[PDB]
Design an enzyme around this catalytic site. Sequence first.
Site, mmCIF file in Angstrom:
data_model
loop_
_atom_site.group_PDB
_atom_site.id
_atom_site.type_symbol
_atom_site.label_atom_id
_atom_site.label_comp_id
_atom_site.label_asym_id
_atom_site.label_seq_id
_atom_site.Cartn_x
_atom_site.Cartn_y
_atom_site.Cartn_z
ATOM 1 N N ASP A 163 0.853 -1.182 0.000
ATOM 2 C CA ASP A 163 0.000 0.000 0.000
ATOM 3 C C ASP A 163 0.892 1.236 0.000
ATOM 4 O OD1 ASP A 163 -2.316 1.909 1.024
ATOM 5 O OD2 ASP A 163 -3.242 0.009 0.582
ATOM 6 N N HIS A 191 -3.535 5.243 4.280
ATOM 7 C CA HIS A 191 -4.390 4.126 3.864
ATOM 8 C C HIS A 191 -3.811 2.789 4.303
ATOM 9 C CE1 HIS A 191 -6.168 1.430 0.627
ATOM 10 N NE2 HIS A 191 -7.253 2.119 0.932
ATOM 11 N N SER A 235 -11.537 -1.263 0.654
ATOM 12 C CA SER A 235 -10.200 -1.274 1.255
ATOM 13 C C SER A 235 -10.188 -1.990 2.598
ATOM 14 C CB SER A 235 -9.683 0.150 1.463
ATOM 15 O OG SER A 235 -9.425 0.829 0.266
#
EC number: 3.4.21.75
Lengths: 4, 473
Positions: free
Chosen positions: B45, B86, B260
């Site tokens: 990520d 994230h 996600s």
Amino acid sequence: XXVK
Amino acid sequence: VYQEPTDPKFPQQWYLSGVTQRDLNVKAAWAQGYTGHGIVVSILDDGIEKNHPDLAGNYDPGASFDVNDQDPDPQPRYTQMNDNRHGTRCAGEVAAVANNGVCGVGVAYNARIGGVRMLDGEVTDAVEARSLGLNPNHIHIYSASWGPEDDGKTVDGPARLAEEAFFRGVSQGRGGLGSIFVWASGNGGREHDSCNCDGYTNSIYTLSISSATQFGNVPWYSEACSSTLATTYSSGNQNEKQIVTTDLRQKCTESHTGTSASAPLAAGIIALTLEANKNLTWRDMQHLVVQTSKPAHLNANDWATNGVGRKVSHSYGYGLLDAGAMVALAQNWTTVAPQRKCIIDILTEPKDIGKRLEVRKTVTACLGEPNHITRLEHAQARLTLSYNRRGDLAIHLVSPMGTRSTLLAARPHDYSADGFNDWAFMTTHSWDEDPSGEWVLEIENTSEANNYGTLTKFTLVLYGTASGSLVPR
Ligand SMILES: [Ca+2]
Ligand SMILES: [Ca+2]
Ligand SMILES: [Ca+2]
Ligand SMILES: [Cl-]
Ligand code: NA
Ligand code: NA
Ligand code: NA
């Protein structure tokens, strides 16, 4: 491209 | 007597446990003794805050790298917008530390957790390959909450280096048992995207994971397709709770959302499952998911019973993961036989599509040969076709046992005239069926327009074995  | 976590936000992690049964049944695995000890998960990520107070105790530098800047340290790039939060959010879902007075807990709160900083920059094929192939004899499970654009018009998947990294991972990774790749099926729901037009989710080598809202519905962002394998809870409307996890700048968030958040929860459950049986292969893990996932109370209008009695949906795959059932079934699991591959070239001549094309073919599934398959795993319809407006196509594949897989639903935004160039549409919905007999491919124009094109190749690729079936459900 590549998206979260 | 197992004592559940005392972390301050654990009571807000409605998806991990509860009296209500709207959960992933994670506490049941914890009480059997499985918390992730010894398992290594990496988040591919935008980085991982390795000093976060709820990650530092589980952080594993061996599970980490910075591919964007070519250094070992995956620390995120701090900005005013907090763009690079994230991966830290995803990491905390897997392996946030338990019983430390901070935030909540990860599904596998004693697992080792790393991150590959690879999205904060130009994501080339080489970048993906170096991330998917990172330390594959140390990292057990890779989690990817990213992929091709969800604009509802893209057809895109791994280029050569990344595909090579998938094959190397499942073949030689984890001591030859195969890297476990967990993928988020996508956020394209508003654009009517299909997750079969995404080569990462559509790969047989990834466990593609979709989402359910707290009240058991198909979230607004969810993409339907036949390659999805199973589901975990994530966010929904503003009356529904969301996901609790570690946030950038050493904070705690209760508003992690979208596709996600689903893949990391699946990666955690898979980590508990690997602790229960470290000898499980990459294919073993998919069999466990198929056998133990739960449709009950997930709402969809397309639930269908396949040829071995299992309920399957294009929104949810085989349903919600069930951690307790996963770890229980893993313990005495008998390794599956080596994977066979039966290639059937279906067409003897090109076929004009027109308003509707149906192609029927009776196959023997390599009868008499060493790749004879009586127990299907994945199946692919590799299609090469031209068409003037791709998104008006709908494509279905019917198995000999009568299971209708939607390989492609209409994509209203997909105006492309580029058709499909040996695109390997994949379905999980005929898992454990006997693939011998009549297969039917349907290609139709869902619009009133006078569209035109030609199907020039249809390869049916069957994967599976010839032994070990269960009595149908
Ligand atoms: Ca760095
Ligand atoms: Ca904690
Ligand atoms: Ca998508
Ligand atoms: Cl292959
Ligand atoms: Na192998
Ligand atoms: Na997949
Ligand atoms: Na048959």
